[PDB]
């Protein structure tokens, strides 16, 4: 395995939860999402790191890097937590904490 | 947020 | 990632390294505000690990980076290990964070936005570039 | 399958 000193980045699609589960199946769930199977992938030490759309000129955290294949391949779907399901709850933590 | 002061480059 | 490239350093600013006790990165992250990370559950973040901000290179010295320690992790109520649902984690800060050129902010989207599939995103981080 |  090989693992950078700097730090990487890569575009890559998102892809449908329907469309995702031909890969994966039930395995999906609605607090995923799935990007990628593009020819990159996010690998293991990854995780818990970002992944941003540009919406009206901003960054915005849409995934969590979360799971997928073993060994990385690039012709599968990553899969992410997606922020959307997930943003109510980070709103009430920071507001109770 | 969301706009780095350092623009990245893809 | 695999077959990604390397960023221009400092240009994903929020981009945080979660290290260990021992200064083994396991895990990246996301600066919301000065005091808050946002980061996978899996990742098992404990106070006794450290979020590091600033980081390009983690082989050279010459970064001025922050090194942050965790006042209190927690784990989404709703993440379950098993199938690996829900999967954040929220990390405060012992002390904040100083924003910088290098070093700021990712915004959070409401519940209600629309990321549509096909849409063209960007995905940063330290992990393996081959397996 | 595997966490990343």
């Keep these: 395995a090989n693992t950078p000193d700097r730090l990487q980045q890569a575009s890559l699609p998102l892809l449908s939860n329907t469309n995702c589960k031909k890969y994966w199946g039930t395995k999906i769930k609605d607090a995923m999402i799935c990007a990628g199977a593009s020819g990159v992938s996010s690998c293991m030490g990854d995780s818990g790191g970002p992944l941003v759309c540009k919406k009206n000129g901003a960054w915005t955290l849409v995934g969590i890097v979360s799971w997928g294949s073993s060994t990385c391949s690039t012709s599968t779907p990553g899969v992410y937590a997606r922020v959307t399901a997930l943003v109510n709850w980070v709103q009430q933590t920071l507001a109770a904490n | 947020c969301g706009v780095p002061a350092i623009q990245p480059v893809l | 990632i695999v077959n990604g490239e390397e960023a221009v350093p400092g240009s994903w600013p929020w981009q945080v390294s979660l290290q260990d006790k021992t200064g083994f990165h396991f895990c990246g992250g ?102 | 399958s595997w966490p990343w």
Excluded at chain 3, 31 to 47: K, M, Q, S
Excluded at chain 3, 77 to 93: A, E, G, Q, V
């Design chain 3, 30 to 131: 996301s600066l919301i505000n000065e005091n808050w990370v946002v980061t996978a559950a899996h990742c098992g973040v404990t106070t006794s690990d450290v979020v590091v901000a600033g980081e390009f290179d983690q082989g050279s010295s010459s970064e001025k980076i922050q090194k942050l320690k965790i006042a209190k992790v927690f784990k989404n109520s709703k993440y379950n290990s098993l199938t690996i649902n829900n999967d954040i984690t929220l990390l405060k800060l012992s002390t904040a964070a100083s924003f910088s050129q290098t070093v700021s902010a990712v915004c959070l989207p409401s519940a209600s936005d629309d990321f549509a599939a096909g849409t063209t995103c960007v995905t940063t981080g330290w992990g393996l570039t081959r397996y």
